[PDB]
């Protein structure tokens, strides 16, 4: 099951107010008009890759979808968060809670905090140790799938957990419709209005329309010719061609000679027909100081 | 909690304590002669009181006195590459006072630990709790140390009997990142009343300048702090005293 992710998934890269100005940034969004997977909520919770993020959407009428667990192992082996709302309190903890055999909510405790008609979009992520809760509730008159429309997704609360997530599993309520778009380090033409709601966005590395859109810094491009980037035939492999040298070089000889010359008569040992690895040099930890002036101290091998 | 503390973390599991909802004065830190090295290229030491910061994290750990230049942008070293990486664009100020008499004991302060083996370089400000045995040779290592099997997380020994080059030294990254998050740790300066239609030297949350201050009708969202023009210069602000 596939879906055309029409316009959803735009949020605030930052929450600094801007007016009638188009800001371009590199950030993690899912592409517009892209392929996203379609799920149902009958009798499905595989552990999808949250490589850098996904966009969640819910068609809800009785508050069935209620939480998430994100992480790298998600089995209390790593720090993993659990979300429950018991009709009065918001509870987001990564503490060592007792998870069920199949993780559900009914119908290393370092982070020391202890306490259709609706579309709900939630993006829980980590960028540089910030945990951004992204939330939006939107009314609609549509039943078939996710609606077509623009919705800025704003931060609410930033909490100190700073967690590795590379693959995620959704949380069910036992006695979840969602979408998975792989985010990429892509550059995005973002539009702010005078009231401060992000009204539109462009994934501008996608198609020629969008490439012109973010090279011309405009959502409307005139008819014409525009250079956008550079095309280079990428190398498919690496070829190394060196002389057929067969003798290990006496670098060890000028390290382990029986005598060394003074500064009054130091020697010029000139070297040809050799192989120099320098890996034994770097593997030797004897170096008291290594001030390597022309060439890299590490990058020489 | 970060200076007069009873317990300091190590470089493998250094505490990343968000410091927020408090007043950061720094004046007692100036008056303290306890610091020996006060190095940072990001901010200045002495002219810091007038600035109000985004959010400050105190990275608490212990490394050697010769290793104090390793906590720097672009420095390459053993601990710098296996325990704690500093980005090239690092903003913030690292403080290293002398720990001649604090983080040491007669038998050896044996609770400070550090990684020495890794097959990859570290990301900035990462948290690696990897407890696998590093593989030195090509033989598979079934938890059995010995030949081609050594464990990376190495410890120190701190005794007052040890030499001053091996004596424990305290280095702490009070990481002063000025990032997007709302300012909460301002200087110990008294506030003044607000003036309109008259240009005045303003210092709003550390940002200095001159200009006129009139009320605005824009609905800044909660957690929305500044309005920047095309020049990213502050065009509008929300008063943090009155909304």
């Amino acid at each position: 099951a596939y879906t055309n992710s029409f316009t959803r998934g735009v949020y605030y890269p930052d929450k600094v107010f801007r007016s009638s100005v188009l800001h371009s940034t590199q950030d993690l969004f899912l592409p517009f008009f892209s392929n996203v997977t379609w799920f149902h909520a009958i009798h499905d919770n595989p552990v999808l890759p949250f490589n850098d993020g996904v966009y969640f959407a819910s068609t809800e009428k009785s508050n069935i979808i209620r939480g998430w667990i994100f992480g790298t192992t998600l089995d209390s082996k790593t720090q993993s968060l659990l979300i429950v709302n018991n009709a009065t309190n918001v509870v987001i903890k990564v503490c060592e809670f007792q998870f069920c055999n199949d993780p559900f909510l009914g119908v290393n405790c370092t982070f020391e905090y202890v306490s259709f008609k609706n579309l709900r979009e939630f993006v829980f992520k980590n960028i540089d140790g910030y945990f951004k809760i992204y939330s939006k509730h939107t009314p609609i008159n549509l039943v078939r799938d996710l609606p077509q429309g623009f919705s800025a997704l704003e931060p609410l609360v930033d909490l100190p957990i700073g967690i590795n997530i590379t693959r995620f599993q959704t949380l069910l309520a036992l006695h979840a419709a969602y979408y998975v778009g792989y985010l990429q380090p892509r550059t995005f033409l973002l539009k702010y209005n005078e009231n401060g709601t992000i009204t539109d966005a462009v994934d501008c590395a996608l198609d020629p329309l969008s490439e012109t859109k973010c090279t011309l810094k405009s959502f409307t491009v005139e008819k014409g010719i525009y250079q956008t980037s550079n095309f280079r035939v990428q190398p498919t492999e690496s070829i190394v061609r060196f002389p057929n040298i067969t003798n290990l070089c006496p670098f060890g000889e000028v390290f382990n000679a029986t005598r060394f010359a003074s500064v009054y008569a130091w020697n010029r040992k000139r070297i040809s027909n050799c192989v120099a690895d320098y890996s034994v040099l770097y593997n030797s930890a004897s170096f008291s100081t290594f001030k390597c002036y022309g060439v890299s101290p590490t990058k020489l091998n | 909690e970060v200076f007069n503390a009873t317990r300091f973390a190590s470089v493998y599991a250094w505490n990343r304590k968000r410091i927020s909802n408090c007043v950061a004065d720094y004046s007692v830190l100036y008056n303290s002669a306890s610091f020996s090295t006060f190095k940072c290229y990001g901010v200045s030491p002495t002219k810091l009181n007038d600035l109000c910061f985004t959010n400050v994290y105190a990275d608490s750990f212990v490394i050697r006195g010769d290793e104090v230049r390793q906590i720097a942008p672009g420095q390459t070293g053993k601990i710098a590459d296996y325990n704690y990486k500093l980005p090239d664009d690092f903003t913030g100020c690292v403080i290293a006072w002398n720990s001649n008499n604090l983080d040491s004991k007669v038998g050896g302060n044996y609770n400070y630990l550090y990684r020495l083996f890794r097959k990859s370089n570290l990301k900035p400000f990462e948290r690696d709790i990897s407890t696998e045995i590093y593989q030195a040779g090509s033989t598979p290592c079934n938890g059995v140390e010995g030949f081609n099997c050594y464990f990376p997380l190495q410890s120190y020994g701190f005794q007052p009997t040890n030499g001053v080059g091996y004596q424990p030294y305290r280095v702490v990254v009070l990481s002063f990142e000025l990032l997007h998050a709302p300012a909460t740790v301002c200087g110990p300066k008294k506030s003044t009343n607000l003036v309109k239609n008259k240009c005045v030297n303003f210092n709003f949350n550390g940002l200095t300048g001159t200009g006129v201050l009139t009320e605005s009708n824009k609905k800044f969202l909660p957690f929305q702090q500044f309005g920047r023009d095309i020049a990213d210069t502050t065009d509008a602000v929300r008063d943090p005293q009155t909304l």
């Epitope: 593997n283 930890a285 | 053993k78 038998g107 050896g108 630990l113 020495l116 083996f117 407890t131 045995i133 030195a136 040779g137 033989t139 938890g143 059995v144 140390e145 010995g146 030949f147 081609n148 099997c149 050594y150 464990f151 997380l153 190495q154 410890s155 120190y156 020994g157 005794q159």
Partner: antibody, heavy 126, light 109 residues
């Protein structure tokens, strides 16, 4: 600068257990792996296994599997070889080893037990 | 012991390649063989590890060579005073971590 203290001469009944100590403290012990090696009276030496003071590694050998466990008290880093439900083959002088290579050197060379411990004997006679 | 002149009566200078027979895991792969020596009159102070790798006061006359199924260390300059106890240890891989044999002894007549 390696300092080494152990238990003394003792006699114990068959089937008993010992809470033996192999106590290293007071220097840069971290570069050294405090392993375990024995020798019988008049025989060649034999290596029981390793104990790694470098933050918590465990791994045994075959000749005393099922009879011995090990733990380390990382505060002052006391080494153990817990002879529990003792048998006939442990009546000898029991010593520790010390992995002599420097661990901040990346090359994993041989263990050099340059300094050797005091004494340990569980003689099982009636 | 592994196949050497296992326990002979030897004066200090006997040019005896006191060997240490190892398999392909030991003679070829385990080239970091070290020689313990529980010395008569003190706790083992071998002062001879990594074959010819020497501490202070130790001569290069203990030559370490791997030849087929045979290790080597020897001495020179025949004298009377070097009655001592020798041991060879190899990384035996599938066996315990590093294992000796039977207890090589050097003694004079």
């Amino acid at each position: 600068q390696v300092q080494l203290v152990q238990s003394g001469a003792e006699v114990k009944k068959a089937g008993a257990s010992v809470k033996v100590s192999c106590k290293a403290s007071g220097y840069t012990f971290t570069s050294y792996d405090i392993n375990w090696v024995r020798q019988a009276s008049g025989q060649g030496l034999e290596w029981m296994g390793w104990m790694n003071p470098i933050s918590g590694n465990t791994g045994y050998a075959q000749k005393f599997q099922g009879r011995v466990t090990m733990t380390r008290n990382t505060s002052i880093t006391t080494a153990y070889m817990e002879l529990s439900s003792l048998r006939s083959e442990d009546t000898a002088v029991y010593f520790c080893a010390r992995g002599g290579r420097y661990c901040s050197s990346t090359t994993c060379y041989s263990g050099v037990g340059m300094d050797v411990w005091g004494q340990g004997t569980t003689v099982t006679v009636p | 012991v592994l196949t050497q002149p296992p326990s002979v009566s030897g004066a200090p200078g006997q040019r005896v390649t006191i060997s240490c027979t190892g398999s392909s895991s030991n003679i070829g792969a385990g080239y970091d063989v070290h020689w313990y020596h529980q010395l008569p009159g003190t706790a083992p102070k071998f002062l001879i590890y990594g074959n010819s790798n020497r501490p202070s006061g130790v001569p290069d006359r203990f030559s370490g060579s791997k030849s087929g199924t045979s290790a080597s260390l020897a001495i020179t300059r025949l004298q009377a005073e070097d009655e001592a106890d020798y041991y060879c240890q190899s990384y035996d891989s599938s066996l315990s971590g590093w294992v000796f044999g039977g207890g090589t002894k050097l003694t004079v007549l």
